Symmetry: D3
Subunit: 117 residues, 6 copies
């Protein structure tokens, strides 16, 4: 995932950051304190960005043409996952974080299938 | 391109960085000093990574679902573009840099097209 | 602009970031939702900082002694441009973003003169 | 791990980066090309630095006084783990990479025990 | 502090960053404006994170096993210092900023003792 | 130095990084091992860049029009210091590092004089 390439990839990198995004949204629903809301917003923004980056790397570095052929829906799925993460940055509703996690789980399923080749 | 979103995007951000990648390769062919080769490799890696990032942003943030419909080859185009940049990272041949610049040139055309649409 | 040096420079890097700063300020006037204001402020801070970095690079790396000799106002001009960006960070008024853009345009004009020459 | 805090932690982040480190050391032994050696060295340095950061976060954010009391060796363990990652930066021997992974495995074990608790 | 290693370390790096934290907390009590509060929180978050980073570097790179044996309280001291910085992030009370600073002083004293020795 | 502004500045930040740059150059002269040379180059590059960043901030954020009026040589002195740092990036000669340290000492002197007035 370092583009050497190193041959070491794992959707867990994206998942763990997306889990923080959703966990932050959940905590935002419980505390309306201004300062807390500002910090949560700032940190959620950064974790979502990191999650988007990990997915972009899977898409550009790990998945190859044969993969995009075996799963003709892969491009859309990844593009949807990153767009779902952008929507999560702009929201405090845990449902947006959940949508991103759902898309990531599907990407993760495909990923390990390509690992079984 | 900041994901606010701000409504400001431009393939030029990617081109300028890719231009440094090619310029660096050309300098690499003419100067074989070790320390220069080390510094040049390091910097080319960074500029190419910034180029990939700029393209990833256009793909994930700028291009909307309707855009991919109107240009069903855009997914592959951007994916080849980023991979072309990855190839440039592992090459001192100015042609690799040019290849990446060529893909970016196509993407730039579809971009301005969606802008005027 | 990578300090190799690579020979590739373009004030357009600073301008695009400055354009985002202004565009964000424009939007901040039309939406007073608290979370939107927080995200807008956070993101404007980053785009302004990037614009400052790009100008600093032009000043330290691209412009050389003969240039400062030919344009004795250049040092002040760049310094004012970066200070204008700092003021844009601390403000929601689109005028502050515009002022930074106007200095950048002046810098850009001087830049292309040094290129043609 | 974002310090909000979000409540989401996983030694896996550290492990994935450390695996890249060892994987790169292995590839280096096989390819003696100068440019590949440079890229491998640069990238290994970055992945190791990331691994160190992830471990630093667990030590400073996740682990609390009660944990250090129940595990009097934790401070030294984590410290030795990060120092091992430092040794891995300065080495091409895949063994140095394994030593870091071994330490991370120990931290991981203590981690989940504090989770199940 | 760069981990080459370069043999150049100084708790000053952490102290200056921790100083901005307290200074910002003080300025926050003097201005209730929303945008100012947002910016101050955003910037305080960054400065504290850098201070934590600098202490982590000292803890993992500068201090060697003998130091932790010579000063049995060192591990706990550094850990308390970074946690105090995390507490400053989540607070606008200049006191939290000061507390983190007092810890840094104690660490700075031990640092010099190990130096002169 | 964070641009809030926070009111906390110190040329020492630049100095400490420049000191690592010269130290690294000295080490490079005593060890010709390829991998050490690669790491030393990569690290010296990052430290020199950070030193430049710190000087850029002093120039853009700390020094004001009255200071530039009082010290007509200030613009040139700072620009010389950052160029000296760029030269040290491209060199293994400790003399280039020492030249940057010399300019920083002059800037430091002026800095503290402005603190006395
Ligand atoms: Ni990798
Ligand atoms: Ni944007
Ligand atoms: Ni360049
Ligand atoms: Ni977290
Ligand atoms: Ni160092
Ligand atoms: Ni500051």
């Amino acid at each position: 995932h370092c583009d050497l390439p190193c041959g070491v990839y794992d959707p867990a990198q994206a998942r763990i950051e997306a889990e923080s995004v959703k966990a932050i949204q959940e905590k935002m629903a419980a505390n309306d304190d201004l300062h807390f809301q500002i910090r949560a917003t700032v940190i959620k923004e950064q974790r979502a960005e990191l999650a988007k980056h990990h997915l972009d790397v899977l898409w550009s570095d790990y998945f190859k043409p044969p993969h995009f052929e075996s799963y003709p829906e892969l491009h859309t799925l990844v593009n949807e996952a990153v767009k779902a993460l952008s929507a999560a940055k702009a929201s405090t509703d845990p449902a947006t974080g959940q949508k991103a996690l759902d898309y990531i789980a599907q990407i993760d399923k495909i990923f390990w299938e390509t690992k079984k080749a």
